[PDB]
Coordinates of C-alpha atoms and ligand atoms in Angstrom, one line a residue:
Chain A
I1 CA 14.5 -8.6 -20.6
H2 CA 17.3 -9.0 -23.2
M3 CA 20.9 -8.1 -23.9
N4 CA 19.9 -4.4 -24.6
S5 CA 17.7 -3.7 -21.5
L6 CA 19.2 -1.9 -18.5
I7 CA 18.6 -5.0 -16.5
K8 CA 20.2 -7.8 -18.5
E9 CA 19.9 -11.6 -18.3
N10 CA 23.0 -11.6 -16.1
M11 CA 23.8 -8.8 -13.7
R12 CA 26.5 -8.2 -11.1
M13 CA 26.3 -6.3 -7.8
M14 CA 28.6 -4.7 -5.3
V15 CA 27.6 -3.9 -1.7
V16 CA 28.8 -1.9 1.2
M17 CA 27.1 -2.3 4.6
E18 CA 28.0 -0.4 7.7
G19 CA 26.4 0.3 11.0
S20 CA 26.2 -1.3 14.4
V21 CA 24.5 -3.9 16.5
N22 CA 24.1 -3.3 20.3
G23 CA 26.7 -0.5 19.9
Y24 CA 29.3 -2.7 18.1
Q25 CA 30.5 -0.9 14.9
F26 CA 31.3 -3.0 11.8
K27 CA 31.5 -2.9 8.0
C28 CA 31.0 -5.5 5.2
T29 CA 31.5 -5.5 1.5
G30 CA 30.1 -7.9 -1.0
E31 CA 30.1 -8.8 -4.7
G32 CA 27.7 -11.1 -6.5
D33 CA 26.0 -12.2 -9.6
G34 CA 22.6 -13.4 -10.6
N35 CA 19.9 -13.7 -13.3
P36 CA 17.3 -11.0 -12.5
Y37 CA 14.5 -12.6 -14.6
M38 CA 15.1 -16.0 -13.0
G39 CA 15.0 -14.5 -9.5
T40 CA 18.3 -16.1 -8.6
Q41 CA 21.5 -14.6 -7.2
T42 CA 24.7 -15.5 -5.2
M43 CA 26.9 -13.2 -3.2
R44 CA 30.3 -13.3 -1.6
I45 CA 30.5 -11.2 1.6
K46 CA 33.4 -10.1 3.7
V47 CA 33.5 -8.4 7.1
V48 CA 36.1 -5.7 6.5
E49 CA 35.7 -3.9 9.9
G50 CA 34.8 -5.2 13.3
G51 CA 35.3 -8.9 12.5
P52 CA 34.9 -11.4 14.0
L53 CA 31.4 -10.0 14.7
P54 CA 30.1 -10.8 18.2
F55 CA 26.6 -11.5 16.8
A56 CA 25.0 -14.0 14.3
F57 CA 25.7 -13.0 10.7
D58 CA 22.2 -14.3 10.0
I59 CA 20.6 -11.1 11.2
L60 CA 22.4 -9.3 8.3
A61 CA 21.5 -11.8 5.6
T62 CA 18.3 -10.3 4.4
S63 CA 19.9 -6.9 4.1
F64 CA 22.5 -7.7 1.4
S65 CA 18.7 -7.2 -3.6
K66 CA 15.2 -6.6 -5.1
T67 CA 16.2 -6.5 -8.7
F68 CA 16.6 -10.3 -8.7
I69 CA 13.0 -11.3 -8.4
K70 CA 11.3 -13.4 -11.0
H71 CA 7.9 -12.0 -12.1
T72 CA 5.3 -14.1 -13.8
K73 CA 1.6 -13.5 -14.3
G74 CA 0.5 -9.9 -14.5
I75 CA 2.6 -8.4 -11.8
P76 CA 4.5 -5.2 -12.8
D77 CA 8.1 -5.2 -11.6
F78 CA 8.5 -2.2 -9.2
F79 CA 12.3 -2.5 -9.1
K80 CA 13.3 -3.3 -12.7
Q81 CA 11.1 -0.4 -13.9
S82 CA 12.9 2.0 -11.6
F83 CA 16.1 2.1 -13.5
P84 CA 18.2 4.0 -14.5
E85 CA 17.1 6.1 -11.5
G86 CA 17.0 3.1 -9.2
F87 CA 15.3 2.8 -5.8
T88 CA 15.7 2.6 -2.0
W89 CA 14.2 0.4 0.6
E90 CA 13.8 1.1 4.3
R91 CA 12.9 -1.5 6.9
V92 CA 12.5 -2.4 10.6
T93 CA 12.7 -6.0 11.8
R94 CA 11.5 -6.9 15.3
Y95 CA 12.6 -10.2 16.9
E96 CA 10.3 -11.9 19.4
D97 CA 12.9 -11.6 22.1
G98 CA 13.5 -7.9 21.9
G99 CA 16.2 -7.4 19.2
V100 CA 15.4 -4.8 16.5
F101 CA 17.3 -4.3 13.3
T102 CA 16.6 -1.2 11.1
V103 CA 18.0 -0.6 7.6
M104 CA 18.1 2.2 5.1
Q105 CA 19.4 1.0 1.7
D106 CA 20.1 2.6 -1.6
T107 CA 20.2 0.8 -4.9
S108 CA 21.7 2.3 -8.1
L109 CA 22.9 1.3 -11.5
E110 CA 26.4 2.5 -12.3
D111 CA 28.1 1.4 -15.6
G112 CA 25.9 -1.7 -15.9
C113 CA 26.6 -2.8 -12.4
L114 CA 24.2 -2.7 -9.5
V115 CA 25.5 -0.8 -6.4
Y116 CA 24.1 -1.3 -2.9
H117 CA 24.7 0.8 0.1
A118 CA 23.1 -0.3 3.4
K119 CA 23.2 1.6 6.7
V120 CA 22.1 -0.7 9.5
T121 CA 21.4 -0.4 13.2
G122 CA 20.6 -3.3 15.6
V123 CA 19.5 -2.4 19.1
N124 CA 18.3 -4.2 22.2
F125 CA 19.4 -7.7 21.2
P126 CA 19.3 -9.9 24.4
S127 CA 22.7 -10.7 25.9
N128 CA 21.8 -14.4 26.3
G129 CA 19.8 -14.6 23.1
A130 CA 20.6 -16.8 20.2
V131 CA 21.8 -13.8 18.1
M132 CA 24.4 -12.4 20.5
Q133 CA 25.4 -16.0 21.5
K134 CA 25.8 -17.0 17.9
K135 CA 23.4 -20.0 18.2
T136 CA 21.5 -19.4 14.9
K137 CA 21.5 -21.8 11.9
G138 CA 20.0 -20.0 8.9
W139 CA 16.6 -18.8 7.8
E140 CA 13.5 -20.8 6.8
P141 CA 11.9 -19.8 3.5
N142 CA 9.0 -17.3 3.7
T143 CA 6.4 -15.4 1.8
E144 CA 6.4 -11.6 1.7
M145 CA 3.1 -9.8 1.3
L146 CA 3.1 -6.5 -0.7
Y147 CA 0.8 -3.7 -1.8
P148 CA 1.2 0.0 -2.8
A149 CA 1.4 2.5 0.0
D150 CA 3.1 5.8 1.2
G151 CA 3.9 6.7 -2.4
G152 CA 5.7 3.4 -2.9
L153 CA 5.4 -0.3 -2.3
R154 CA 5.0 -1.7 1.2
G155 CA 6.1 -5.2 2.2
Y156 CA 5.3 -7.3 5.3
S157 CA 7.4 -10.3 6.3
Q158 CA 7.5 -12.9 9.0
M159 CA 10.5 -15.2 9.2
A160 CA 11.8 -18.0 11.4
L161 CA 15.4 -18.4 12.2
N162 CA 16.8 -21.8 13.0
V163 CA 18.5 -22.0 16.4
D164 CA 20.7 -24.5 18.2
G165 CA 18.6 -27.3 19.6
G166 CA 16.1 -27.6 16.8
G167 CA 13.9 -24.7 17.8
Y168 CA 13.1 -21.3 16.1
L169 CA 13.5 -17.6 16.8
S170 CA 10.8 -15.6 15.0
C171 CA 10.8 -12.0 13.7
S172 CA 8.6 -9.8 11.5
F173 CA 9.3 -6.7 9.5
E174 CA 7.7 -4.0 7.5
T175 CA 9.5 -2.6 4.4
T176 CA 8.8 0.4 2.3
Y177 CA 10.3 0.3 -1.2
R178 CA 10.5 3.7 -2.9
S179 CA 11.3 4.3 -6.6
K180 CA 13.5 7.2 -7.6
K181 CA 11.3 7.5 -10.6
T182 CA 8.1 9.5 -10.7
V183 CA 4.9 7.5 -9.8
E184 CA 3.4 8.3 -13.2
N185 CA 6.6 7.1 -15.0
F186 CA 6.0 3.4 -14.3
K187 CA 3.3 0.8 -13.7
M188 CA 2.5 0.2 -10.0
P189 CA 1.8 -3.4 -9.2
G190 CA -1.2 -4.3 -7.1
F191 CA -1.5 -6.6 -4.0
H192 CA 0.8 -9.7 -4.4
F193 CA 3.4 -12.0 -2.7
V194 CA 7.0 -12.9 -3.2
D195 CA 8.3 -16.3 -2.1
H196 CA 11.8 -16.1 -0.7
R197 CA 14.5 -18.7 0.0
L198 CA 17.7 -17.3 1.4
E199 CA 20.4 -19.9 1.9
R200 CA 24.0 -19.8 3.2
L201 CA 26.4 -21.7 1.0
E202 CA 29.8 -21.3 2.6
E203 CA 31.5 -19.5 5.5
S204 CA 35.0 -19.2 7.1
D205 CA 37.0 -17.4 9.8
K206 CA 34.1 -16.9 12.2
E207 CA 31.7 -15.7 9.6
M208 CA 34.2 -13.1 8.4
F209 CA 33.6 -14.5 4.9
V210 CA 30.1 -15.7 3.8
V211 CA 28.5 -16.8 0.6
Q212 CA 24.7 -16.5 0.3
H213 CA 22.3 -17.5 -2.3
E214 CA 18.7 -16.4 -2.8
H215 CA 15.7 -17.5 -4.9
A216 CA 12.7 -15.1 -5.1
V217 CA 9.5 -15.2 -7.1
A218 CA 6.7 -12.7 -7.2
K219 CA 3.2 -14.2 -7.7
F220 CA -0.4 -14.4 -6.6
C221 CA -1.7 -16.9 -3.9
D222 CA -1.4 -20.5 -5.0
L223 CA -5.1 -21.0 -4.2
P224 CA -7.3 -20.1 -7.2
Chain B
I1 CA -9.7 -40.5 5.8
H2 CA -12.6 -42.7 4.8
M3 CA -15.7 -43.9 6.6
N4 CA -14.1 -45.5 9.6
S5 CA -12.1 -42.5 10.8
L6 CA -13.6 -39.9 13.1
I7 CA -13.1 -37.3 10.4
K8 CA -15.1 -38.3 7.4
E9 CA -14.7 -37.2 3.8
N10 CA -17.5 -34.8 4.6
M11 CA -18.1 -33.1 7.9
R12 CA -20.6 -30.6 9.3
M13 CA -19.9 -28.1 12.1
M14 CA -21.9 -25.8 14.4
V15 CA -20.6 -22.7 16.1
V16 CA -21.5 -20.2 18.8
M17 CA -19.5 -17.0 19.1
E18 CA -19.9 -14.6 22.1
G19 CA -18.0 -11.6 23.2
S20 CA -17.7 -7.8 22.6
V21 CA -15.9 -5.3 20.5
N22 CA -15.1 -1.9 22.0
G23 CA -17.5 -2.8 24.8
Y24 CA -20.4 -3.8 22.5
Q25 CA -21.8 -7.2 23.4
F26 CA -23.0 -9.6 20.7
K27 CA -23.6 -13.3 19.8
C28 CA -23.4 -15.3 16.6
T29 CA -24.3 -18.8 15.7
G30 CA -23.4 -20.7 12.5
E31 CA -23.7 -24.0 10.8
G32 CA -21.6 -25.2 7.8
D33 CA -20.3 -28.2 5.9
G34 CA -17.0 -29.0 4.2
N35 CA -14.6 -31.7 3.0
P36 CA -11.8 -31.8 5.6
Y37 CA -9.3 -33.6 3.3
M38 CA -10.0 -31.2 0.4
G39 CA -9.4 -28.2 2.7
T40 CA -12.7 -26.6 1.7
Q41 CA -15.8 -25.4 3.7
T42 CA -18.8 -23.1 3.6
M43 CA -20.7 -21.7 6.6
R44 CA -23.9 -19.8 7.1
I45 CA -23.7 -17.3 10.1
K46 CA -26.3 -15.3 12.0
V47 CA -26.0 -12.5 14.5
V48 CA -28.4 -13.6 17.2
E49 CA -27.6 -10.9 19.8
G50 CA -26.5 -7.3 19.3
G51 CA -27.3 -7.1 15.6
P52 CA -26.9 -5.0 13.5
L53 CA -23.3 -4.9 14.7
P54 CA -21.7 -1.4 14.8
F55 CA -18.4 -2.9 13.5
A56 CA -17.3 -4.7 10.3
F57 CA -18.2 -8.4 10.4
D58 CA -14.8 -8.9 8.6
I59 CA -12.9 -8.8 11.9
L60 CA -14.8 -11.9 13.0
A61 CA -14.4 -13.9 9.8
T62 CA -11.2 -15.7 10.7
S63 CA -12.6 -16.8 14.0
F64 CA -15.6 -18.9 12.8
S65 CA -12.2 -24.2 11.6
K66 CA -8.8 -26.0 11.5
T67 CA -10.1 -29.5 10.7
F68 CA -10.7 -28.4 7.1
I69 CA -7.1 -28.1 5.9
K70 CA -5.8 -30.2 3.1
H71 CA -2.4 -31.7 4.0
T72 CA 0.0 -32.5 1.2
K73 CA 3.2 -34.4 1.5
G74 CA 4.7 -35.5 4.8
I75 CA 2.9 -33.0 6.9
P76 CA 1.2 -34.6 10.0
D77 CA -2.2 -33.2 10.6
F78 CA -2.2 -31.6 14.1
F79 CA -6.0 -31.2 14.1
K80 CA -7.3 -34.4 12.6
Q81 CA -5.0 -36.4 14.9
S82 CA -6.5 -34.7 17.9
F83 CA -9.9 -36.4 17.8
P84 CA -11.9 -37.7 19.6
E85 CA -10.4 -35.4 22.2
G86 CA -10.3 -32.4 20.0
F87 CA -8.3 -29.2 20.4
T88 CA -8.4 -25.5 21.2
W89 CA -6.8 -22.4 19.6
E90 CA -6.1 -19.1 21.2
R91 CA -5.1 -16.0 19.3
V92 CA -4.5 -12.2 19.4
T93 CA -4.8 -10.1 16.3
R94 CA -3.3 -6.6 16.2
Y95 CA -4.4 -4.1 13.5
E96 CA -2.0 -1.4 12.3
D97 CA -4.4 1.3 13.5
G98 CA -4.7 0.1 17.1
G99 CA -7.6 -2.4 17.1
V100 CA -6.9 -5.7 18.9
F101 CA -9.0 -8.8 18.6
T102 CA -8.4 -11.7 21.0
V103 CA -10.0 -15.2 20.8
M104 CA -10.2 -18.4 22.8
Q105 CA -11.8 -21.2 20.9
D106 CA -12.8 -24.8 21.7
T107 CA -13.2 -27.4 19.1
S108 CA -14.9 -30.7 19.9
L109 CA -16.5 -33.7 18.1
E110 CA -20.1 -34.6 19.1
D111 CA -21.8 -37.4 17.3
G112 CA -19.8 -37.0 14.1
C113 CA -20.5 -33.3 14.1
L114 CA -17.8 -30.6 14.9
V115 CA -18.7 -28.1 17.6
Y116 CA -17.0 -24.7 18.0
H117 CA -17.2 -22.3 20.8
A118 CA -15.4 -19.0 20.4
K119 CA -15.1 -16.3 23.1
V120 CA -13.9 -13.0 21.5
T121 CA -12.9 -9.6 22.7
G122 CA -12.0 -6.7 20.5
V123 CA -10.6 -3.5 22.2
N124 CA -9.3 -0.1 21.2
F125 CA -10.6 -0.1 17.6
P126 CA -10.3 3.5 16.3
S127 CA -13.7 5.3 16.4
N128 CA -13.0 6.6 12.9
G129 CA -11.2 3.6 11.5
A130 CA -12.5 1.4 8.7
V131 CA -13.7 -1.3 11.1
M132 CA -15.9 0.8 13.3
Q133 CA -17.0 2.8 10.2
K134 CA -17.9 -0.4 8.3
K135 CA -15.7 0.5 5.4
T136 CA -14.1 -2.9 4.9
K137 CA -14.5 -5.2 1.8
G138 CA -13.1 -8.6 2.7
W139 CA -9.7 -10.3 3.2
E140 CA -6.9 -10.9 0.7
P141 CA -5.6 -14.5 0.7
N142 CA -2.5 -15.2 2.9
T143 CA 0.0 -17.7 4.1
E144 CA 0.2 -18.7 7.7
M145 CA 3.6 -19.9 9.0
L146 CA 3.7 -22.6 11.6
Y147 CA 6.0 -24.6 13.9
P148 CA 5.8 -26.5 17.2
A149 CA 6.0 -24.4 20.4
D150 CA 4.6 -24.1 24.0
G151 CA 3.6 -27.8 24.0
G152 CA 1.5 -27.3 20.9
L153 CA 1.6 -25.7 17.4
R154 CA 2.3 -22.0 17.0
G155 CA 1.0 -20.0 14.0
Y156 CA 1.9 -16.6 12.7
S157 CA -0.2 -14.6 10.2
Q158 CA -0.2 -11.3 8.4
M159 CA -3.3 -10.3 6.5
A160 CA -4.6 -7.4 4.5
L161 CA -8.2 -6.2 4.7
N162 CA -9.7 -4.4 1.7
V163 CA -11.1 -1.0 2.6
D164 CA -13.4 1.5 0.7
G165 CA -11.3 3.5 -1.8
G166 CA -9.0 0.7 -3.0
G167 CA -6.5 0.7 -0.1
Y168 CA -5.7 -1.9 2.6
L169 CA -5.8 -2.1 6.4
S170 CA -3.2 -4.6 7.7
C171 CA -3.1 -6.8 10.7
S172 CA -1.0 -9.7 12.1
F173 CA -1.6 -12.4 14.6
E174 CA 0.0 -15.2 16.6
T175 CA -2.0 -18.3 17.3
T176 CA -1.3 -21.2 19.6
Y177 CA -3.1 -24.4 18.7
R178 CA -3.3 -26.9 21.6
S179 CA -4.4 -30.6 21.3
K180 CA -6.4 -32.2 24.0
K181 CA -4.5 -35.3 23.3
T182 CA -1.2 -36.1 24.9
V183 CA 1.9 -35.0 23.0
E184 CA 3.1 -38.6 22.8
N185 CA -0.2 -39.7 21.3
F186 CA 0.2 -38.1 17.9
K187 CA 2.8 -37.0 15.4
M188 CA 3.8 -33.4 15.7
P189 CA 4.4 -31.6 12.3
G190 CA 7.5 -29.6 11.7
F191 CA 7.9 -26.1 10.3
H192 CA 5.4 -25.5 7.5
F193 CA 2.9 -23.2 5.9
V194 CA -0.9 -23.1 5.3
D195 CA -2.2 -21.0 2.4
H196 CA -5.6 -19.5 3.2
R197 CA -8.3 -18.0 1.1
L198 CA -11.3 -16.8 3.1
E199 CA -14.1 -15.3 1.0
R200 CA -17.5 -13.8 1.8
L201 CA -20.2 -15.3 -0.6
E202 CA -23.3 -13.7 0.9
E203 CA -24.4 -11.0 3.4
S204 CA -27.8 -9.5 4.2
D205 CA -29.6 -7.3 6.8
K206 CA -26.6 -5.2 7.8
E207 CA -24.5 -8.3 7.9
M208 CA -26.8 -10.0 10.3
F209 CA -26.6 -12.9 7.9
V210 CA -23.3 -13.9 6.4
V211 CA -22.1 -16.9 4.3
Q212 CA -18.4 -17.5 4.2
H213 CA -16.2 -19.9 2.3
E214 CA -12.6 -20.9 2.9
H215 CA -10.0 -22.9 1.1
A216 CA -6.9 -23.9 3.1
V217 CA -3.9 -26.1 2.2
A218 CA -0.9 -27.0 4.3
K219 CA 2.4 -27.3 2.5
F220 CA 6.1 -26.4 2.3
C221 CA 7.6 -23.5 0.4
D222 CA 7.0 -23.6 -3.4
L223 CA 10.7 -22.8 -3.7
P224 CA 12.9 -25.9 -3.4
Ligands
CA1 CA1 23.2 -17.7 -8.8
CA2 CA1 -4.4 -11.2 3.7

């Protein structure tokens, strides 16, 4: 938790994301900073290929950083304990209107910097839906539910995306976090939750440049 | 909120549940008491027909009371505002292993006493799953996500059921809460959450007798 740990008080991250949505190929790069133990981070993202994207950047937001989660109480940190080896996370998000977004991400530590590589694939997003019509306005906060499974840590999420008009477009996903470290080489946390608040700070050139910020805290249910 | 409102500081309720699970017919009756504004309640339940049930009572637990939810800041109470007319709630729960439990419930106020009628139908539960094999051990707490929709209030939940061996069986459901009062006759809440903690206190005679307790609080994300 100090200046000598692999995960220091302040950490930087570099990201490369590539894939497609409804057959449209694209690529993004990002760089950010954060305080892992405070569960806070901010990232600057650029669309280097395929921009301006014909779909809402919002569907990519939750795919650009598990190391930055504040842990209190007695909840072992699955991600921080994984280094130097690191970890991966895989996920499938299903939107109520048919769209599906799947991701395979790799997280590594290279020369004190966190490196992310995400391969994403979005399919079946409705032609007239809020996503393909770019009528989204950011995500509401949410609470992820987690417990060990499949040799790793499983997460379940349900989120609501703000859409033009004041309504919401909902989606849910299941994630499997896998450590590159042996199961017997770290403490596995038990059932717990993680509150998340992912917020967009800036944007320009038809979302070809985006600045995101996220606050995340692992904990037990507020109710005693 | 006091003694001149339809919903008193202390309220009692009666419930009749009828339906089937995997084709097995059954009936339950219950009576309880709670403090609506504190968001706490306790209920004694009896299986009057079909007992001993060939499936885990746990799958029925969340179907036996929306009036007992503590509302914090500026979150209009959808349910308390509904009286004297009352409200209904409909829901479909899908378990990760194939089981599906659907419910249609009616909530009314009769002489200061809350009356519940729930018609339930469970189908496709795996013959060798934890539910049909009675290898469940209660629910973990959870956080329901809600926002107005379809002329009422929509709710999304994801829950984890403890099973013999230390593992978990997950499920998720969508609920639509409908007031019997005109939309323009009450204040509709906005997007918000409700933390829930449903616990079994007692059970006897192959679950033909069960005492449940629940604590529920409506609020906004802990992360500001
Ligand atoms: Ca920051
Ligand atoms: Ca749960």
